[PDB]
Amino acid sequence: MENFEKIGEGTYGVVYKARNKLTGEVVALKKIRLSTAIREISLLKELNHPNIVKLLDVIHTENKLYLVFEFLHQDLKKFMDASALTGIPLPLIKSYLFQLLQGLAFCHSHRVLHRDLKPQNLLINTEGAIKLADFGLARAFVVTLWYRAPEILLGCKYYSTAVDIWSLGCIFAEMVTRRALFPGDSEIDQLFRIFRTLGTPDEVVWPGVTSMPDYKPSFPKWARQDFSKVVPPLDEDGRSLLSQMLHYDPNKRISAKAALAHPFFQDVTKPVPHLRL
Ligand SMILES: CC(C)[C@H](CO)Nc1nc(N[C@H]2CCN(S(C)(=O)=O)C2)c2ncn(C(C)C)c2n1
């Protein structure tokens, strides 16, 4: 009431659409009901890029943290559902993947990881842009497992930039096929869905995997499927890029900067989506 409608529930709290009393601007206010996290989150006010949802302010009051963001009108999950009968056109999938890779390459260059990328934290506007929301929040602080990289599911506690490339690969596949790639409903179901598609990992494709905290020698041994079966009708360039984003070994997975130079983006453009708001 001093300085200012519910949108829904997010990973760290409730998000509201609100009007700033001093400026008249419409913003998204995220209330995180609860000192190290305050300094860390406050530093993200400097992590500004056209493909990163702007964090305007970080307020600590009455033992609660409020994050004030730029407001966007739709998320990618709602846009994919709106497009379920025809699919998103390939040039717009390409544009959105390219823009998300630019946003990741910027954050990764500043050593900031997301760790929890998913369609609900990718927001779009009427000008053809897509933006990443919530970078840096996981480090400072049902939850979907569908986009979680296999090193996280296998108990590695040292995250690298590769976890975000894996999640983006999963989202890319879901834009093309109109279905989630690995819709697990438990940690083991998530792992076994990844293993049934990509094959059970072993020391040949992922050195050190058998020494991971949650690796079990008793995991079933599935053979790998071809990407031509997984994401039809994506062309050879797109399937090659997806295969590099879903390598098991996080050291082998393509970086966001290298992905921007992939042949799949030779003809990239920026189409304008028709949005129904
Ligand atoms: C509660 C959810 C997690 C939601 C995403 O569905 N969060 C959300 N929504 C925003 N805008 C909504 C407006 C209506 N659409 S929708 C639900 O119809 O797709 C998106 C939004 N603008 C900026 N931010 C910041 C905090 C990252 C936002 N965070």
Side-chain angles (χ1 to χ4, degrees), residues 3-4 6-20 23-32 35-62 64-110 112-156 158-265 267-275 277:
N3 299 295
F4 300 93
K6 189 172 163 294
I7 297 173
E9 299 138 344
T11 56
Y12 302 113
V14 53
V15 185
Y16 297 94
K17 185 178 184 176
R19 185 182 313 275
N20 183 287
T23 72
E25 187 56 270
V26 167
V27 297
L29 175 64
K30 182 168 298 218
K31 183 216 296 165
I32 295 164
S35 53
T36 181
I38 301 165
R39 328 192 167 104
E40 292 173 289
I41 299 166
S42 297
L43 280 168
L44 302 169
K45 283 193 283 174
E46 300 189 33
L47 196 66
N48 300 133
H49 180 278
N51 298 108
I52 299 303
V53 180
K54 184 173 183 42
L55 180 53
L56 305 165
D57 278 292
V58 180
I59 306 156
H60 187 201
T61 190
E62 300 196 46
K64 303 173 169 177
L65 196 57
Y66 297 89
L67 303 195
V68 184
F69 288 97
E70 162 191 18
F71 177 79
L72 286 90
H73 290 261
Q74 189 158 294
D75 73 24
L76 183 68
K77 180 186 203 311
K78 182 170 177 179
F79 182 67
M80 283 194 296
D81 290 342
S83 304
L85 294 181
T86 173
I88 296 174
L90 181 65
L92 181 61
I93 290 180
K94 188 178 293 195
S95 175
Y96 284 174
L97 182 61
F98 190 83
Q99 286 180 68
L100 295 170
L101 289 165
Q102 289 175 79
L104 281 192
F106 172 77
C107 297
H108 292 175
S109 75
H110 290 286
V112 178
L113 303 189
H114 188 299
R115 307 176 180 194
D116 192 28
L117 286 168
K118 59 199 175 281
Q120 272 199 106
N121 51 35
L122 300 179
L123 291 159
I124 57 173
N125 70 17
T126 56
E127 300 279 84
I130 186 164
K131 307 197 187 195
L132 298 135
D134 289 5
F135 256 88
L137 298 190
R139 188 186 186 278
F141 295 130
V142 181
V143 72
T144 190
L145 299 171
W146 300 356
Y147 312 95
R148 188 171 288 195
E151 61 272 28
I152 298 174
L153 300 165
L154 288 169
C156 191
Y158 290 99
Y159 302 109
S160 82
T161 56
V163 304
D164 290 334
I165 292 290
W166 178 278
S167 301
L168 189 57
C170 292
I171 290 168
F172 176 28
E174 183 171 346
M175 290 194 280
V176 169
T177 65
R178 314 176 217 164
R179 197 174 171 163
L181 180 61
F182 304 130
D185 60 359
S186 74
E187 291 182 274
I188 202 70
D189 183 61
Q190 187 69 38
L191 272 170
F192 289 178
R193 277 175 180 274
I194 294 166
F195 294 0
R196 289 185 196 106
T197 296
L198 301 182
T200 303
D202 60 17
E203 287 290 335
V204 170
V205 304
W206 189 352
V209 70
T210 66
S211 292
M212 292 285 263
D214 303 331
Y215 176 88
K216 310 290 174 170
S218 60
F219 287 153
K221 276 99 182 114
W222 283 282
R224 181 174 183 88
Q225 299 172 14
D226 295 273
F227 278 89
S228 59
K229 180 196 154 82
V230 185
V231 292
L234 191 60
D235 68 43
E236 206 78 41
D237 287 319
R239 286 186 270 109
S240 168
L241 172 60
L242 179 65
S243 78
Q244 298 187 115
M245 295 176 84
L246 299 183
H247 278 328
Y248 271 123
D249 182 351
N251 292 293
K252 295 195 182 71
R253 213 169 290 153
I254 196 167
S255 68
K257 194 177 196 201
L260 288 167
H262 194 278
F264 185 61
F265 296 120
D267 57 349
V268 72
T269 67
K270 187 178 182 179
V272 291
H274 177 258
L275 299 186
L277 304 173

